[PDB]
Amino acid sequence: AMDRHKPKSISSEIWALSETSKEWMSNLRPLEARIVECIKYTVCCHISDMHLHNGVPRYIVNMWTPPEVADQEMKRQNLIFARPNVPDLLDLKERKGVYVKVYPDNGTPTDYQTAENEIFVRVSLSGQMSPITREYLDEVQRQDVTNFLVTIYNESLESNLLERMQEL
């Protein structure tokens, strides 16, 4: 139904997959929230894309999977966490749970305390990365994530979309 509103920079399949999520639907600004949620997903895909550890994908992406499935994954890997929300990714190399946060943001996100087995990737819409994020992500990951963010940021400046997302 909202298809006319999909940014060019979001893939059709990610946009379609986002219909399985009630999160953006619960927001008072649902289109803006849906775009941000798709940005978050896309960032998870760039972090994980073709990155291997011991010959197989380094990461398990839990975002947009059922929490009971993510729990199966966490139990099978013995990577267990105690937040209400499950990590967005499991990093099987570092043995960490990864949470991704997107800041509609002129500015660089600030790092705040996490548990020892957690990493919080914190990125702005304008392509900025928190200090802990920049250190955690490798050069290829930083490039892939930032090039995507800058692409959608620059698309959003061509309409009222960036301003609207800043109104989240």
Residue numbers in the entry: 0 to 167
Please give me the paper's original passages concerning this structure.
To overcome this problem, we produced the homologous domain from DHOV PA (40% identity between full-length THOV and DHOV PA, 29% for the N-terminal part), which readily crystallized and the structure was solved by the Single wavelength Anomalous Dispersion (SAD) method using seleno-methionine labelled protein. The resultant model was then used to solve the THOV PA-Nter structure by molecular replacement. The three domains clearly have the same fold, and THOV and DHOV PA-Nter are very similar. For THOV and DHOV PA-Nter the putative active site is more like an extended groove and furthermore, is positively charged. Indeed of the cation binding residues, only an equivalent of influenza Asp108 (PD motif) is found in THOV and DHOV PA-Nter, respectively Asp-86 and Asp-87. The extra positive charge in the putative active sites of THOV and DHOV PA-Nter arises from the replacement of acidic residues and the introduction of extra lysines (Lys38, Lys61 and Lys97 for THOV and Lys39 and Lys100 for DHOV PA-Nter). Using the Thermofluor assay to measure apparent melting temperature (Tm), we found that in the absence of any divalent cations, the Tm of THOV and DHOV PA-Nter domains were respectively 41 and 53°C compared with 44°C for IAV. For the DHOV domain, which is already more stable, addition of these ions has little effect, giving no indication of cation binding. Finally, neither THOV nor DHOV PA-Nter show any nuclease activity against various RNAs under conditions where IAV PA-Nter does. Our structural and biochemical results therefore strongly suggest that THOV and DHOV PA-Nter domains neither bind divalent cations nor are active endonucleases.
The three largest gene segments of the Thogotoviruses, THOV, DHOV and JOSV are homologous to those of IAV and code for the heterotrimeric polymerase. In this paper we present the atomic structures of the putative PB2 cap binding and 627 domains of THOV and the putative PA N-terminal endonuclease domains of THOV and DHOV. Despite very low sequence homologies, all domains have similar folds to those of the corresponding IAV polymerase domains. However, the critical active site residues in the putative cap binding and endonuclease domains are not conserved in THOV and DHOV and, contrary to the case of IAV polymerase, neither domain shows the expected in vitro biochemical activity.
